Structure 1
């Protein structure tokens, strides 16, 4: 058959440096008369995949010279010189010479930037929601780096583990940071049996957790 392996899954790289994605096929892509139909695609977060290189090393119109393809037989390589913030996304290689045409698993290019601490904000349930008998407590941990971050929820001193749903964004081409939201959902009834609601952000940028919270103490 036709199998395509892409290495590695994720690839960290500094601005100005080079990166190399590897793509391996399961047979000689020696067409039948000449070229090999090996292709490279990039899909930037929130967008559609777009053609970077076709026929092993053919740069598609509009694609910077920084990008280059090569290889032969079973090993193909996409190279990216002087990396820019905009180049972040998920790179895919494609095999179309054989049946069926197939896509490699993909590779996510990550951009190494300066360690940055998250900006934390907490929000109590709206009045609209409380009327519906529900209560979600939202906490935003915005613009930080590296991606690894941990958020712990605490109710009146004690930590709450259930009812919490987290979500991370993709790396932002803008400032190369990541953002995340942690949502604690409770029924209006239970919610009103406590006063202290807290979310703590634990990140590499500090020895102690960034802590935000509010009390249902009158205001």
Structure 2
């Protein structure tokens, strides 16, 4: 019932630069003992949440001096003085004063880095899968930034639509890049009808689309 809001929802930042995440509660979190029941968490990709700041301004044990918290009753600020690549992830505020306890929706920190075009790889369907009646063609985009990227599938130069799916990683905690997987799925019979399989990649780091392809059976 107590509403925790956050701004921004997405925060791009160049390493070495400061970042500020704001939080707001729909009512005061100050207690009769003068505690402000406001807590800050960071959840890194693939990990459970991690406490950074407790009761508005207290740094949890192990947490670098880079992190500080401040606030005025219902408005609070998590501050990072020198953002590092390792700080990528989702930052949550929370109140543990009025049941039901509540978290903010999270602010995703994005590390800004130099544009990096993807390296691109295409994998034909395995013979093992073909035996099962299906054919998946996989296109890998590796170590790129920014995240925005367009993958187009072409079979015998025909543009495919509606028969692929893709997945993107979270941002890497070391080099601040992304990778992406796209799978084109066909009947085995339809795979064996056509010759040229290509994935065409459009990305800001590429002066013109890159195409990786193969001919079925060499």
Specify if TM > 0.5: yes
Alpha-carbon deviation of 1:206? 2.1
Q: Matches of residues 179-218 of structure 1 in structure 2 within 5 Å?
A: 179-216=179-216, 218=217
Quote the residue 1:159 is aligned against. 159
Quote the residue 2:92 is aligned against. 92
Length-normalised TM-score, structure 2: 0.98
Moved more, 14-23 or 1-10: 1-10
Deviations 1:42-77 (A, max 9, x none): 000000001000010000000000000000211000
Alpha-carbon deviation of 1:145? 0.4
Matched, 1:138 2:160: no
In 1, Cα distance between equivalents of 2:133 and 2:101: 52
In 1, Cα distance between equivalents of 2:88 and 2:24: 22
Matched, 1:18 2:18: yes
In 2, Cα distance between equivalents of 1:50 and 1:205: 34
Quote the residue 2:104 is aligned against. 104
Alpha-carbon deviation of 1:207? 2.9
Length-normalised TM-score, structure 1: 0.98
In 2, Cα distance between equivalents of 1:124 and 1:6: 45
Alpha-carbon deviation of 1:155? 0.6
The 3-state SS of whatever aligns with 1:115 is coil
Alpha-carbon deviation of 1:112? 0.4
Alpha-carbon deviation of 1:100? 1.3
The 3-state SS of whatever aligns with 2:11 is strand
Matched, 1:149 2:149: yes
Equivalent pairs, count: 218
In 1, Cα distance between equivalents of 2:130 and 2:144: 31
Quote the residue 1:69 is aligned against. 69
In 2, Cα distance between equivalents of 1:100 and 1:72: 22
Quote the residue 1:83 is aligned against. 83
CA RMSD after TM alignment: 0.8
Alpha-carbon deviation of 1:28? 1.4
1:29–1:72 contact (8 Å) kept in structure 2: no
